[PDB]
Write a protein that binds this ligand. Structure first.
Ligand code: A3T
Ligand code: A3T
Lengths: 145, 143
């Protein structure tokens, strides 16, 4: 799994078209979404992650949470961003892992938002540009490294 | 080298303060910048790139140019983005490679912009969200 964390003044997205044959079911009101003063977590679930979804998800939850604490971000946004990596996990597994991370961040106490899975999405972001406002994290099963 | 390509309506940046002891010298006008209808190339020069700056630079220019062609963009913006990777190349080397890529793209005939090297920078971007609007590239020179 590759994660790109961006501490932002806001994140806004717009669904444009389906990117998969069967994307995550959503309502019309979800075709556009937005969150303020947020740590945006762009995530690409990799093939290697398929070896242990739970382990990877738990590690992602920990790493994202640690950065949110550091920058004092009360809001976190899980953004499916497949093309952050070249070797992708199959969609069904990617969705599963992203759901687990969302659930975990929620359980940690953060106000969590997310963008629909399986779509081509336009987005607008404004990175605060502070010391820890741009960070990347590589998370893989312990057996895979 | 790790490259994140974002086809965008615009890219705007604001230099905060230096993030290294000796950043690229800049004039007041270079502290801010904007480009529209542009393929933004966020680049992190990796330690592995130090082995062959010329090779990695040439491949990067080729890959970026190919994507620009695919998305039909004429504007390209080189954005130093160290945090796309964990194993960073030495700054002197990073700056040289970013400049080589910047110039290589200009040589292809593109309208190219670049943000200053060595600073903490705030930025705003708006991704088109069409197919190929978001692509990444891992360029590693074996020789
Ligand atoms: C396309 C671009 O604008 C948009 N932002 C997009 O990336 N869409 C992805 C994710 O929503 C999801 N998806 C599929 N596989 C994965 C994966 N391995 N990891 C994360 N997401 C995935 O399905 C879409 C196509 O890959
Ligand atoms: C900080 C963040 O907001 C800003 N956007 C930033 O990344 N600033 C980087 C690059 O401009 C440059 N830099 C240093 N090493 C590298 C490298 N290996 N590759 C690319 N750039 C580098 O030096 C600055 C501090 O690392």
């Amino acid at each position: 799994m590759r994660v790109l964390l961006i501490h932002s003044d806001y994140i806004e997205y717009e669904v444009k078209d389906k990117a998969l044959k069967n994307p995550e079911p959503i309502s019309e009101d979800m075709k556009r979404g937005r969150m303020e003063e947020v740590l945006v977590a762009f995530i690409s679930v990799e093939k290697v992650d398929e070896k242990n979804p739970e382990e990877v998800s738990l590690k992602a939850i920990e790493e994202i949470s640690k950065v949110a604490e550091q920058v004092k971000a009360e809001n976190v946004f899980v953004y499916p961003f497949a093309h952050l990596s070249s070797e992708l996990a199959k969609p069904s597994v990617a969705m599963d892992i992203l759901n687990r991370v969302y659930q975990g961040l929620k359980e940690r106490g953060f106000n969590v938002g997310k963008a629909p899975f399986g779509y081509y999405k336009a987005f607008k972001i404004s990175c605060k540009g502070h010391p820890l406002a741009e960070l990347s994290r590589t998370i893989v099963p312990e057996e895979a490294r």
